[PDB]
Design an enzyme around this catalytic site. Structure first.
Site, PDB file in Angstrom:
ATOM      1  N   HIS A 150       0.891  -1.221   0.000  1.00  0.00           N
ATOM      2  CA  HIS A 150       0.000   0.000   0.000  1.00  0.00           C
ATOM      3  C   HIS A 150       0.933   1.279   0.000  1.00  0.00           C
ATOM      4  CE1 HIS A 150      -3.369  -2.771   0.876  1.00  0.00           C
ATOM      5  NE2 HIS A 150      -2.693  -3.201   1.925  1.00  0.00           N
ATOM      6  N   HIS A 182       5.741   7.080   6.366  1.00  0.00           N
ATOM      7  CA  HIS A 182       5.453   6.643   5.008  1.00  0.00           C
ATOM      8  C   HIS A 182       4.828   7.813   4.274  1.00  0.00           C
ATOM      9  CE1 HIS A 182       1.590   6.139   7.061  1.00  0.00           C
ATOM     10  NE2 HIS A 182       1.085   6.455   5.881  1.00  0.00           N
ATOM     11  N   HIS A 242       2.058   9.121   0.909  1.00  0.00           N
ATOM     12  CA  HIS A 242       0.969   8.927  -0.042  1.00  0.00           C
ATOM     13  C   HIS A 242       1.256   9.847  -1.216  1.00  0.00           C
ATOM     14  CE1 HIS A 242      -1.454   6.808   3.011  1.00  0.00           C
ATOM     15  NE2 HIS A 242      -0.748   7.578   3.819  1.00  0.00           N
ATOM     16  N   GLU A 251      -3.429  13.431   0.994  1.00  0.00           N
ATOM     17  CA  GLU A 251      -4.670  12.979   1.622  1.00  0.00           C
ATOM     18  C   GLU A 251      -5.433  14.169   2.196  1.00  0.00           C
ATOM     19  OE1 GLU A 251      -3.507   9.410   4.051  1.00  0.00           O
ATOM     20  OE2 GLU A 251      -4.441   8.464   2.299  1.00  0.00           O
ATOM     21  N   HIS A 302       3.584  11.062   6.365  1.00  0.00           N
ATOM     22  CA  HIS A 302       3.001  10.822   7.681  1.00  0.00           C
ATOM     23  C   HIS A 302       4.066  10.231   8.587  1.00  0.00           C
ATOM     24  CE1 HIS A 302      -1.304  10.454   5.887  1.00  0.00           C
ATOM     25  NE2 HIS A 302      -0.863  11.697   5.954  1.00  0.00           N
ATOM     26  N   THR A 330      -5.738   6.618   8.053  1.00  0.00           N
ATOM     27  CA  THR A 330      -6.280   6.831   6.716  1.00  0.00           C
ATOM     28  C   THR A 330      -6.296   5.568   5.877  1.00  0.00           C
ATOM     29  OG1 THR A 330      -4.185   7.529   5.707  1.00  0.00           O
ATOM     30  CG2 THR A 330      -5.560   9.253   6.761  1.00  0.00           C
TER      31      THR A 330
END
Length: 258
Positions: A62, A92, A94, A104, A117, A196
């Site tokens: 992911h 990590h 996104h 996000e 994050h 999230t």
């Protein structure tokens, strides 16, 4: 048929396995800067990362996580909206398929190219697995990424991604200093929210920095070469691994700055 970011398993489907997806304090959210209220009782953030011990980097299917030794108070967040001491466990990102999406959280509906994050857990609960079951269990420091000049402190992450291209691959990743990922200012917005990704638990005090960091086009292009799939499966590029903004419901976003 497990959750992901595709057409048939993406964020709009998550509520079937994780009904809390429609809960009262879900993340991320749009940060309406004019509606956020300055709170003069909010303290400056205290980021103490000088003794951080990174251990490993992992493609979990992911995102990729840079993991830290959290068995002692080595890299901690305190101050700001927080009571007590929160230990860094991993960070990590996104990111998007294009520079105009990927974050996000959004700011007045603006999407950034990516979002970092830094995940911390409240030491009063003893371990991360117990902390996620508590309404004040986690503190996540969110940092926006825009594309422009390179971030030198990110390059060591970028250069190892070739070794963890596919789901389940990990690599030794010691002596990484997360201070190199922080912007100059620690001005922030804060609100109560959730993880999230599934299990979407409502255990997070979110602290989102106002100042984004800049990364180069070449740096973000290397994120987009990662794979959601494991080795020997059909290649699906790890892009657009972001959950969209969720309803604010009965929450107020507070600002540390005027």
């Amino acid at each position: 048929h497990h959750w992901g970011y595709g057409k048939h398993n993406g964020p709009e489907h998550w509520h079937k396995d994780f009904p809390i997806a429609k809960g009262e304090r879900q993340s991320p959210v749009d940060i309406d800067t004019h509606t956020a209220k300055y709170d003069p009782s909010l303290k400056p953030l205290s980021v103490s990362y000088d003794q951080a011990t990174s251990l490993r980097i992992l493609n979990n299917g992911h995102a990729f996580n840079v993991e830290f030794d959290d068995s002692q108070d080595k890299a901690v967040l305190k101050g700001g909206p927080l009571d007590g001491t929160y230990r860094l466990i991993q960070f990590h990102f996104h990111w998007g398929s294009l520079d105009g999406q990927g974050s996000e959280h959004t700011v007045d509906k603006k999407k950034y190219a990516a979002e970092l994050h830094l995940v911390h857990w409240n030491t009063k609960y003893g371990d991360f697995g117990k902390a996620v079951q508590q309404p004040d269990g986690l503190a996540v420091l969110g940092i926006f990424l825009k594309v422009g000049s390179a971030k030198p402190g990110l390059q060591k992450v970028v250069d190892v991604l070739d070794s963890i291209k596919t789901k389940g691959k990990s690599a030794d990743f010691t002596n990484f200093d997360p201070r190199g990922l922080l912007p100059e200012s620690l001005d922030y917005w804060t609100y109560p929210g959730s993880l999230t990704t599934p299990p979407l638990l409502e255990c997070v005090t979110w602290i989102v920095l106002k100042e984004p960091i800049s990364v180069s086009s070449e740096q973000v292009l290397k994120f987009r070469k990662l794979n959601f799939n494991g080795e020997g499966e059909p290649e699906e590029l790890m892009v657009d691994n972001w959950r969209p903004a969720q309803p604010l419901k009965n929450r107020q976003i507070k600002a540390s700055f005027k």
